[PDB]
Amino acid sequence: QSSAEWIACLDKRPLERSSEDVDIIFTRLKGVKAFEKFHPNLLRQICLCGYYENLEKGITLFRQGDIGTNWYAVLAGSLDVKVSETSSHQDAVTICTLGIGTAFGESILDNTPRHATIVTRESSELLRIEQEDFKALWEKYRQYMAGLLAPPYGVMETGSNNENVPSEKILRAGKILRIAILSRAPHMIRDRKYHLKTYRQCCVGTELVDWMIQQTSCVHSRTQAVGMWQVLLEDGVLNHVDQERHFQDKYLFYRFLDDEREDAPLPTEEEKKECDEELQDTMLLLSQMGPDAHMRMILRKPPGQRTVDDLEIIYDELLHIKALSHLSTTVKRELAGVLIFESHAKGGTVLFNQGEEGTSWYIILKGSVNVVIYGKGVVCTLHEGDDFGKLALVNDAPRAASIVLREDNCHFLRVDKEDGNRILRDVEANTVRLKEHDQDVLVLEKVYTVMSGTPEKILEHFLETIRLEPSLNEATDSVLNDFVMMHCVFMPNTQLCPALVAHYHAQPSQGTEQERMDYALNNKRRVIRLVLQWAAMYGDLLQEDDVAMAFLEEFYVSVSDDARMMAAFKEQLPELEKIVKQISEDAKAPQKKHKRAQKRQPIRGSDEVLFKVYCIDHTYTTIRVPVAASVKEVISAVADKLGSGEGLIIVKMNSGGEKVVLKSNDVSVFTTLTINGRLFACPREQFDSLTPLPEQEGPTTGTVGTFELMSSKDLAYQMTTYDWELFNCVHELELIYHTFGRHNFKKTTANLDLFLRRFNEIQFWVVTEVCLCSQLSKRVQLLKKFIKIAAHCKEYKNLNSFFAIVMGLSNVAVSRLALTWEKLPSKFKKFYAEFESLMDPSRNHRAYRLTAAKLEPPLIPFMPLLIKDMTFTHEGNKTFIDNLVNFEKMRMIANTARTVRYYRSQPFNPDAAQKNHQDVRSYVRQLNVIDNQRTLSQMSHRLEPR
């Protein structure tokens, strides 16, 4: 089912409610900061009457002065709060920003005209509660809302005015760890001598670092270790014998709180078992809290006194602070050096007063504040993640508001006006902006770096910066790569090729007739240089783009006709003309089949396929059409052989019986089906009697008997070679097309399609075998078997199949088998737990980033994740900016494609011994699975009811 289906429920009108509709939504809503203190009954009530709003950037929900009609909670995005001190909304200024989890609008409780104009700052998702529903929830649950709502509706301060440093989970965490140490490395805690004085039962920093690195795979560096221990030290569960505020990887003594009492009792066998079961989850917990605890520690160093390392640690965390999201990478790297960290102990502290001089911009790291405006009162309340006082960075105007802390122990980041402006200027000092008609036409940063422009202008910069020195030959290929790769986005060949023809013949704009003699020569050599790097990118794909080939043809002429010649440059061009003259000259697609043991070969759109298209009566006609055939072309080929009347539709149908009518303009539909998906052609008349085939149902009997006689390392090995074949069949540009929309470029992504499909194919392979293994003793053997298969995959640096398997073993159908997991040897409970941790999405799948980075090609990446990166970057950044191609976006997406190149820049071939029989190869490459979840789930409930 859809990850986010709760939204579909918020759609369903209130009166048409369903218990599950509420169960689902509630499961989602419970995770909002403005619902935390909410009694379950309240949250349900909200679920029953709560509307959903998906607003676009720049929408105003209401203006200062209007009558308010709803109360809101932000699920995603952010909004600006603007207030005017006059009767003109043009004078309104932004005082603060509200992000996820924050709520506003409660002034409707007593019918007070809106204090402020609120505007979405970006695409936002809100929960909307109509006045009458809210007045009702408030009278009923007022006591549960006093902490959330601004006065007079709730209390002002929720701080000390009607507890120590340790918290519950961290006090716990410190206990687990001390128990593991005492158990695993007793020597680590003991009396230690240093200059006559002896420090009782304590540890050494470097040593705790050493140990944490040994005990778990989620820790990749001593620096990361430091952050993780600093979690316990700031919280005071692990203390430096001399009370330093920060943990250090040094020869310094620290003591566990438990060892603070002379007679600290040894661990009980129960505690050790209890610890042994929690160590992994404790470590994962600390890995997630560790980055920001480290940022805070380093940040306590004055801006001027921060080292390169300090700044990196700070920089890395900023990337995960919403408030800083819209800032550039450069400004963020600049901020690391000026950001001040500021904390306050007591609620009620006045951070600043309305009317005072505007000094700083604040971002709330911990706690909350009240926004106060004289005359109006508390206008809104802000929480962690929100920011305020940004007016101070615009002009020299006075505070339009007062900020008082709403609770004790608030943390903020603070940027002072002075530093903020230096950064803004220094950013122009490293900028270079060529203006044409009195506006930017090209922008760049000192190495230089293109940022934006038009296709024509961006093209000349790349031609113009080319270096024809054979020494910079590689360095030149480098700079041109982003352009040759991404150009299809903002400048297709239909516009590029002609533009290159022009540049080649164009007459030099400066110089003597003789000087120009030379100029035109270089320009020509440069244009040829770019064409070559251009042909290199497309490579084999050239023979799909009729234009591109036509161009080269006429372009090879121009290069020849020259009386004098570019000796050491031309030869390469004819090579391409001949190869496009040769391999293009053939009457073989080659005809491809799909319904032994082939070594995968790249599939091309122009390649013809023999494909089965089924009919209502489950008969089928085999048509022979190009891979890139359109739906219309397919219908025509079918309607012809069958003589089928007017009105045939083509329909995708998955094992689930689900049916999608395909559009006539759709291309390459063969590779975009589900694992067991089939393709049908029938009359729209009898669209309803269309039913899946018996074969799509999936296998009925397991296959455990077969591959249990196969070693985990042989299956893995054979899975990896196969994976490599699929992986290497993917042209780097297929990634580009996919990210931007295959339908656009009218080219295929068949190879990428098959490879991504392969991922899903593997994970359903796991869920299938498990669910088709009725015996309880023989499933436990599979978990061991799949876990070992994964292990060998990761060992082979095939992260692709590794994650596929792990995601299979995480499938609800497999996860719910409580009885089956519990009887698994603790050894494999450990491996698997470590496996899930690499799939942690926190900080943008950092766990995975670090794991892969610490490896050397050949390597198969976690490809679906890698696809999301591109999709993400695409949607979170505009291609065009004021009618100018956003080239930094281009580069960011090229970043990913290039990472693929690197991953497959070394051949794959481990120890000679795989030799291995073709039997395991056959199995691995001929998987037959159940891809119907509803099915797999039902089975799961027929092996272990509940």
Author numbering: 10 to 171, 178 to 462, 480 to 627, 639 to 957, 960 to 991
Authors' account:
While both the N-terminal regulatory region of EPAC1 and EPAC2 contain a Dishevelled-Egl-Pleckstrin (DEP) domain and a cAMP binding domain (CBD), EPAC2 has an additional CBD in front of the DEP domain. When the intracellular concentration of cAMP rises, it binds to the cAMP binding domain (CBD) of EPAC and induces conformational changes, in the hinge and switchboard (SB), that lead to activation of EPAC by exposing the C-terminal catalytic core, which interacts with and activates down-stream effectors, Rap1 or Rap2 partially through residues in the Helical Hairpin (HP).
A phenylalanine to glycine substitution at this position leads to a constitutively active EPAC2-F435G capable of activating down-stream effector Rap1 in the absence of cAMP with 60% of the WT EPAC activity under saturating level of cAMP. First of all, even though EPAC2-F435G is active in solution without cAMP, the apo-EPAC2-F435G crystal structure still represents the compact, inactive apo form of EPAC2, trapped by the crystal lattice, which is incompatible with the extended, active conformation. The structure of EPAC2-F435G shares the tertiary and secondary structure of apo-EPAC2. The domain-by-domain Cα-RMSDs between the two structures approach a resolution limited low value of 0.3 Å, while the overall Cα-RMSD reaches up to 1.2 Å. Second, while structural changes immediately adjacent to the site of mutation between WT and EPAC2-F435G are relatively small, major structural deviations occur at distal sites, particularly at the C-terminal catalytic lobe, suggesting global allosteric effects of the mutation. The F435G mutant is intermediate between the apo-WT and holo structures, but more similar to the holo-conformation. Overall, the N-terminal regulatory region of the F435G mutant is more dynamic, particularly at the N-terminus (residues 23–30), the CBD-A/DEP linker (residue 169), and the hinge/switchboard region (residues 439–462). Last, while almost all the sites with major changes in B-factor show significant RMSD alterations from the previous crystal structures, one region, the hinge/switchboard (residues 439–462) stands out: it showed the largest increases in B-factors but exhibited little structural perturbation.
